[PDB]
Amino acid sequence: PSMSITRLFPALLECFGIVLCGYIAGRANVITSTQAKGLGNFVSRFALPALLFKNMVVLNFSNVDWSFLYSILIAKASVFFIVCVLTLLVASPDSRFSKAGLFPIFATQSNDFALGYPIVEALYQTTYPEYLQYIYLVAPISLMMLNPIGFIFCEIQKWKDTQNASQNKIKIVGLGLLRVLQNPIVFMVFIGIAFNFILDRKVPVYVENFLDGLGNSFSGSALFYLGLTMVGKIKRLKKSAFVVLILLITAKLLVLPLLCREMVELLDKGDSVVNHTSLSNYAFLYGVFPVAPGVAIFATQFNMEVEIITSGMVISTFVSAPIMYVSAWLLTFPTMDPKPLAYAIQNVSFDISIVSLISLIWSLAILLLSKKYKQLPHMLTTNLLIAQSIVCAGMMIWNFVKEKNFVGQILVFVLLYSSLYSTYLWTGLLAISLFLLKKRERVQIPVGIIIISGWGIPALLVGVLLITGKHNGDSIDSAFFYGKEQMITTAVTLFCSILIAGISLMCMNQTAQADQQLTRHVLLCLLLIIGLFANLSSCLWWLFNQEPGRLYVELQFFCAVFNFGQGFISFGIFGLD
Ligand SMILES: O=C(O)Cc1c[nH]c2ccccc12
């Protein structure tokens, strides 16, 4: 491909595995606060400056694509102006300046060095090595463009809160600009651009090896210190702050990458559509990088609004992993032929299945060791988690077995799609069971029957498939393995589970119009009903329409996201306690 996207899942799991290890080590008291502050000083005083010094001396400025820099800088300036004006017009009259200073920095400035760079290295080190340069151009230039406007607003808050409230605007501007110049990023970028010419882009060998030893450690060490600083740092936001934060994380991770893509499309006019499309897709990938930890440091230095900013940096860090994996593959699909595209969706399914199965094994282990799996509504959720685990496991086994014996393919198909149908039906059965719990006049729910229904009716539907369908031993995507009958059966399973679920939740509400965790159960059901409607749409599109008009590709991708990553929904609702 134009982009070595198979290395994205290992890259994401390396980066976020390091952040998760840092978070675990931080909780587990493996590391003292003196060690944590030593690590912060290593990361910020030596390693980041060394990485910047290295890359800035190396960089051949006369054959950078300045077009991409202008694009991302105009896009970040656009999201800056937008978020800044929106904040100053929306927020409360006194404290609006801290918000209007820090929020657009939050919405534009990203973690480009710690995890953007290993990700762009993974995606583009072979296919476009010049794209690794642009992190070191974009992130600093955007810092010294946009962070002084935001800092100047924050300093206006500091000056207005400071009861003297009348001093020089020049001093406000100067102190804001000074924090930008004192930042090791822009500091070292100026210094390294000077050394660029003083050495004519050649680091002396001894300096080169010293800078390599330090700079290469920045990626891993920065992500580990990020893990340490995440300890407890998502302190429970007020719901109004959560609303503000949803908008800001949407800004950084959806509006900015969309805007970057549009800007590159407007401003690049290079020679070929392939290089243009690759640069456009790189612009989107750039937008998706999470908020820079430096933004939390700025909020702490101003002593202002640490709660929203730290919580949002941490949440944005984690939310960028799904959106990056999703967005990168989604942007790749329009270039692929139908057969490579089937391999692409099975690759997506396999990756999401690994991380979903880990989340499900954790969630299962919680429900089992909690022994809450005995309770009447949670016994059924446990069976759903087992069905989701067998989905993800059957997908993992299937990704290998689709090459191996026809005997093995049929067995693994039976396991995989019977359990997939079982998760489908368990959505509806969990809804009808929480309706039975709400219809509290009733006897104890027939657990044996509801279990035999959720497991056995899908076994009957797949036995039906083996007997009534015909086998596509070529076909890569398991969802077409038994041809038309496969999708007919899938559609009927989805249609039944959606009818059951929707009628159950409607009737639950109509009963209300007169720990069981009925709210969390209905949340699990509702999010799964979104997924079931998506899968029903895929089935009914492929059935009633002969042609997969291109939305069918994006929808089959989201079907795979849901089918194999629904373990994330069940983990988010139960695995986090
Ligand atoms: O915030 C950034 O963009 C870079 C960075 C500076 N100090 C850090 C500590 C941990 C992780 C990343 C960073």
Curated annotation (Swiss-Prot):
Residues 346-577 are annotated as: GPCR. The chain crosses the membrane at residues 5-25, 46-66, 71-91, 100-120, 134-154, 180-200, 210-230, 240-260, 282-302, 313-333, 348-368, 381-401, 405-425, 447-467, 487-507, 524-544, 555-575. GO terms for cellular component: extracellular exosome; lysosomal membrane. Residues 26-45, 92-99, 155-179, 231-239, 303-312, 369-380, 426-446 are cytoplasmic. The keyword Transmembrane applies. The keyword Glycoprotein applies. Coiled coil: none annotated. GO terms for biological process: cellular response to amino acid starvation; cellular response to cholesterol; cognition; intracellular signal transduction; negative regulation of BMP signaling pathway; positive regulation of TORC1 signaling; transmembrane transport. Cholesterol binds at residues 9, 23, 232-234, 520. One of its GO terms (molecular function) is cholesterol binding. It is found in: Lysosome membrane. Cholesterol binds at the interface between the PIN-like transporter region and the GPCR domain; these two regions likely coordinate to sense cholesterol and regulate mTORC1 activation. Cholesterol-binding protein that acts as a regulator of mTORC1 signaling pathway. Acts as a sensor of cholesterol to signal cholesterol sufficiency to mTORC1: in presence of cholesterol, binds cholesterol, leading to disruption of the interaction between the GATOR1 and KICSTOR complexes and promotion of mTORC1 signaling. Upon cholesterol starvation, GPR155/LYCHOS is unable to perturb the association between GATOR1 and KICSTOR, leading to mTORC1 signaling inhibition. Binds indole-3-acetic acid and may play a role in tryptophan metabolism. This is Lysosomal cholesterol signaling protein. It comes from Homo sapiens. The chain holds residues 35 to 714 of 870 of the full protein.
